[PDB]
C-alpha cells in the first residue's frame, strides 16, 4: 500500500529471507561464537549478525528501518574491521552482500520517510 509507514516491516522481512538464502551471508548469519574467537572482541565493539536483525525485528524492537539498516550496516563494518585482507573470500562475501543489502534498502528507506510525512501531516 502506497504511504503505508508499516510497509517497511515485511520489506525488511522479505529482504532478510533473501540475504539468509543467499550463499554470501553464510559467515554472518548467526553471531561469532567469542569463546571459539577469542580476540573477536579484542577488535569489534559491538558484534552483529543477522539473526539479531531478524530476531528484533520479529519481536518489534526496531523502531524504524533506519535502526535495522544501522544493525545491517555494523555486520559489514565489522567484517571489515576483522578480517585482515581484500584478499580474504569473507571479506569478499561481504562486498558483494552489502551491494545487494544497500540496492534494495534505499527505496524502504524513502517510502518509509514519505509515509511518515503522510502520517504527521495529513487532515484525511
Ligand atoms: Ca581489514
Same mark, same amino acid.
Given at each position: 500500500?502506497?504511504? $503505508? ?8 522481512? =522479505?529482504?532478510?529471507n ?5 550463499? $554470501?551471508?553464510?559467515?554472518? /548469519?548467526?553471531?561469532? $561464537? ?7 572482541? $579484542?577488535?569489534?565493539? #559491538?558484534?552483529?549478525?543477522?539473526? *539479531?536483525v531478524? =530476531? #528484533? ?10 535502526? +535495522?539498516?544501522?544493525?545491517? /550496516? ?5 567484517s571489515?574491521?576483522? #578480517?585482515?585482507?581484500? /584478499? ?13 543489502? =544497500? =540496492?534494495?534498502?534505499?527505496?524502504? +528507506? ?6 511518515? /510525512?503522510?502520517?504527521?501531516?495529513? *487532515?484525511?
Amino acid at each position: 500500500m502506497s504511504y $503505508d509507514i508499516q510497509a517497511w516491516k515485511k520489506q525488511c522481512e =522479505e529482504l532478510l529471507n533473501l540475504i539468509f538464502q543467499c550463499e $554470501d551471508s553464510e559467515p554472518f /548469519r548467526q553471531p561469532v $561464537d567469542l569463546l571459539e574467537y577469542p580476540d573477536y572482541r $579484542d577488535i569489534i565493539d #559491538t558484534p552483529m549478525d543477522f539473526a *539479531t536483525v531478524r =530476531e #528484533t525485528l520479529e519481536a518489534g524492537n526496531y523502531e524504524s528501518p533506519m535502526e +535495522l539498516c544501522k544493525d545491517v /550496516r555494523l555486520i559489514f563494518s565489522n567484517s571489515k574491521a576483522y #578480517t585482515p585482507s581484500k /584478499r580474504s573470500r569473507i571479506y569478499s562475501m561481504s562486498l558483494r552482500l552489502s551491494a545487494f543489502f =544497500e =540496492e534494495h534498502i534505499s527505496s524502504v +528507506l524513502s517510502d518509509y520517510k514519505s509515509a511518515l /510525512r503522510f502520517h504527521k501531516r495529513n *487532515t484525511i
